[PDB]
Prior knowledge:
The chain has two helices and ten strands; from the N terminus they run βααβββββββββ. The chain is mainly β. The PDB classes it as transport.
Amino acid sequence: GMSNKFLGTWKLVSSENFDDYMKALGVGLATRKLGNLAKPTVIISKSGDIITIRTESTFKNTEISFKLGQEFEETTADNRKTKSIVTLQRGSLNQVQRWDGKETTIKRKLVNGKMVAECKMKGVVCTRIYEKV
Ligand SMILES: CCCCCCCCCCCCCCCC(=O)O
Ligand SMILES: [Cl-]
């Protein structure tokens, strides 16, 4: 199952290439200007087979709850209405989002007590690092 080590409250400590990633997502300038300044808190909890990922920033909050491998409807921070699925591959929590024939991936894994989120969209690769708070 998903590592309990994922469970808890995390906070952004580093972001590489987030602007280009958002740009690839078609994000608007207003949301980009703020997304580049934002240092979100990610809270991850799990109950039975139900997992929740909550994102909090002074600018925008998001929350998704899901079961591994079961596609669900998601509304992203940038107001994308996507069909999403989260899977587990070698202890890496992998989210795929599909919309308008397009596709993006967010892979979250633990690295020396840190959580690393790699965001991919059309050759643009973003790395956001979180610390456990
Ligand atoms: C609410 C935090 C997101 C920052 C605001 C910018 C909106 C862009 C949304 C694109 C998806 C970003 C998800 C980041 C992945 C992660 O770090 O967990
Ligand atoms: Cl913030």
